[PDB]
């Protein structure tokens, strides 16, 4: 029935009078930046990260007179976590490319879309990463935290929402002990995009084909060493934000309590990751409490949320907008 | 004439009754809009003939939908006649402006049903198109 | 959009019964073959609106003669629908690949007849169109 | 004069249309506030990085942002002065150029 | 959690009676003993659940054999209820450290015989198992 | 059973020695030469050809004294024409191509002989490829020049057929204005013998070997850019030529007639084009009447069929 597609007779959808179409107008790329903010550091067992957490404390005792006391043991467990590949090629029957001599603009033009997309699935990952369900992938932020009687339960913040329209803020902090990511050995982290060169495909028949192609790897992990560095404010009903801090749910106290969440914010550095639908009500509702306070005639227009605690306030579009709200 | 091996549709249908094509191409987005393209036209070959109890037209056409599914027609040609679907005759259409995923090529045949005609279908960039132009017509 | 007053065909004409379009584009040959220039392309835009006791559809068709006389289509839309022709809607025909001499347009409106609406059809080289593109779509 | 117009992407390109102009008041009271309105307006597009930005409003408009700039103000810290307020200049800042050549009354867009 | 394609057995095989594996691990030795390497294990995911008539248990066991023909049991898990397979639930049998050429998954269902849920079995170093632990818990 | 490989086997492998390679002389191949009269020219449009063909002229106005005259306007009509490619690799058991030494020499033979096989198969394309049969391939001749109805049709004569026994014979004029073959842009002109590497191929087991390959992409069409130099002789009906050209129809008149026919040989070159059969008929009967029939040069070629069906 429907036929495709590695990569159908529409290079003719990229071109002029001429060549390969070289200012195109990236639309579908957003601006998320976990990927950039990120901390990668080898992982250290052998495609695991290994950590041991203390379980128990030795309490002590009053001992009555006279009364030779028992001897404490502190237990203590350890976890290990995994790491996931993300790898593509990306093929073009060398016939195609190469007419007009596009074989080059073409070559490029392809490829500014697949970093894009390596960014965007990595960072659509590390937030919803279910290695649960998809096992290939490495498990992200939810659902580590998604239950309210996980232990880690107290540190998601609930907003306080009901619907399937609600988001959440994230809140951690990046730092070698607390929360990074973890990559392998040897491969490198991150997004390798080597160029494989032209070599022979097969048609389906076996008929013969040949192209290029283009390798993507990109291979990552997550150590989330303790949840008490991480907390996350959910069920942030987007519809009913206002920016007169008024019905729904505020940003500005359901942000800061997040801050008090966080044990010393001591190391690495901690970044708040919201929603741009979020940054946006954010830096009206900021206006708005400021406003009926002191804020100069020229100030009207907000600073752009840059440092709300002295923490980054990081803009990740790679974060669902209508999430399932969190029971 | 280069073509896509994807493109091609209803390879050589024996279009016998009014029916749509065998396949349907789908287009990797909700709009393709591939006549935006200013290249991309469908064409439709004809063999052996559109031999039928007549006197018969075939009138193709394209159609979009939404999924694999609901079909309307974005475009069309006419009543083209029969015996002038000899074996070698390009109905082409250039590409509707507006596609949507999900293309496939409709043969409306007016009745009767034919009797013999296959029709090969595929978007292509572009048609072999050379008729004869006249000379003088003097000389002679 | 870039005019040729010579293609200007239906200026604002009010298309109520299915009807043909006013002027007809002669062009100074037996075949043009106009769809070749891969360029030229017929518009209809439409003003005000395809009012009409309804439900009608209007389906815009390019028709050829030999010589202006009788006309047969061409190239043919489909069933445009009323609430697809509000103030603003540019429906394009791309220029048949084998035209002839004496092009016109014909509005063959599916019952009832229209009670109001203008269409202004002319092949221009080419069109604006510029459909919104989506944005992630995950935000927002 | 020969000119047509590109808008490569709209994302770059953000309307605040269905403006009531009769509801408009100063103390950004009734009708729509135009102070968020426009911050909004702001916030919609990507990293406003190249080339440069710019707002386009009626000087009804600009007028009526003036009086309900130095309104919003005004419940904070506004000086004798300053009670007339700062003609509007940069919003952002991002200029805030007049237009006459733009229509006042236009039917609502839904 | 990365994974070894040849290691994986049970891609992923819809358990219904008390069957076993469809593929069969054949390492290139008499003795493998890859428990013994000490980093090499089963794990068992589930999906979707556990649907059954019911009260059934699933009890995953890794068995071995000389020759790839008749096996026998070097690991088991024990009667893991209905219930307790909901969509991602990672059942972990550590290699067994003496192994034999051809190690296979068996899946002894008690009865009724389950109705839904399929379960995919590789050997991998290691798996992902992070679960949160308490803090105070007086604070809490 | 029966072992059927495509690949180089020892058997294939070992006549090519010796203890000498080279040299092949090739009897059954077919001896064809459109292709070296043919021209190049790198097509234009994106995998057409577009070329736009004067369709009316302004005729001028005698203007007697103090006498405005009236302007004219010069119509266009423009006509595109594609291209088709055929590719075709040629693999061998890497062991065994390299054995003895003879890597470059045995590569080169298949070279010679790939290129042999390739000129047949686009020459005979090129005179009766349809765009509409085949599909895929480009089209060269027929139909362009085949309903007597056509606008180019006073450029078909025919020698009177009626039963499909029956050649035609071509007349071209190759020229860079004036029919020519075209190629992408930007793929080279002509067969390319593009060699690959070593790279592991399979064995229907799996039990893989390594071994070369080598590509042979060859794209052309053929722009056919106005018939008016170019005439075909169609039913020239073969069972009824004989050496005294007076049973049957007769080549001489008959080719003449095809030749004060075009406007004007100036540029590039003619040439006439006929089947060994039929150029061995004419000259039988040019000698009765006693490389260059008549101020053009007679290519006769061998991939051009002898029975097609005859035209109306």
């Known amino acids: 029935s429907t036929t495709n597609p590695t990569l159908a007779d529409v290079a003719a959808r990229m071109t002029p009078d001429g060549k390969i179409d070289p200012q195109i107008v990236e639309m579908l790329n957003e601006t998320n930046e976990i990927l950039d903010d990120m901390t990668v550091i080898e992982a250290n067992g052998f495609t695991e990260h290994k950590t041991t957490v203390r379980s128990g404390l030795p309490t002590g005792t009053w001992r009555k007179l006279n009364y030779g006391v028992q001897p404490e043991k502190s237990r203590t467990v350890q976890v290990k976590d995994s790491m996931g590949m993300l790898e593509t090629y990306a093929e073009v029957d060398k016939a195609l490319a190469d007419l007009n001599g596009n074989s080059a603009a073409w070559r490029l033009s392809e490829d500014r879309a697949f970093i894009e997309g390596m960014n965007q699935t990595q960072a659509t990952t590390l937030f919803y990463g279910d290695s649960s369900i998809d096992a290939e992938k490495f498990m992200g932020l939810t659902p580590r935290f998604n239950s309210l009687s996980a232990e880690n339960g107290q540190n998601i913040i609930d907003a306080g929402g009901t619907g399937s329209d609600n988001a959440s803020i994230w809140l951690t902090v990046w730092g070698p002990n607390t929360l990074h990511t973890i990559y392998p050995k040897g491969s490198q982290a991150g997004l390798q995009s080597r160029d494989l060169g032209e070599d022979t495909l097969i048609d389906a028949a076996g008929g013969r084909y040949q192209g290029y192609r283009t390798h993507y790897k990109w291979d990552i992990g997550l150590t989330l060493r303790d949840w008490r560095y991480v907390v996350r404010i959910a069920n942030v009903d987007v519809s009913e934000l206002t920016k007169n801090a008024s019905a729904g749910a505020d940003l500005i106290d359901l942000m800061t309590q997040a801050v008090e969440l966080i044990p010393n914010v001591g190391m690495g550095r901690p970044a708040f990751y919201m929603p741009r639908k979020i940054r946006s009500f954010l830096r009206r509702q900021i206006t708005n409490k400021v406003a009926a306070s002191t804020l100069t005639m020229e100030e009207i227009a907000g600073k752009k949320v840059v440092a709300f605690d002295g923490i980054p306030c990081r803009r990740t579009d790679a974060l669902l907008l209508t999430e399932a709200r969190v029971v | ?140």
């Open chain 2, 1 to 140: 004439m280069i073509i896509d091996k994807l493109l091609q549709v209803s390879d050589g249908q024996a279009v016998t009754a009014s029916a749509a094509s065998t396949d349907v191409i789908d287009f990797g987005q909700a709009n393709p809009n591939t006549g935006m393209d200013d290249r991309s036209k469908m064409v439709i070959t004809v063999d052996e003939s559109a031999d039928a109890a007549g006197a018969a037209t075939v009138t193709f056409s394209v159609q979009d939908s939404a999924d694999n599914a609901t079909f309307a027609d974005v475009a069309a040609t006419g009543a083209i006649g029969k015996a002038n679907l000899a074996a070698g005759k390009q109905v082409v259409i250039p590409m509707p402006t507006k596609l949507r995923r999900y293309c496939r090529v409709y043969y409306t045949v007016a009745t009767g049903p034919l009797t013999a005609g296959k029709f090969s279908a595929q978007v292509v960039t572009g048609i072999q198109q050379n008729v004869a132009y006249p000379d003088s017509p003097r000389i002679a």
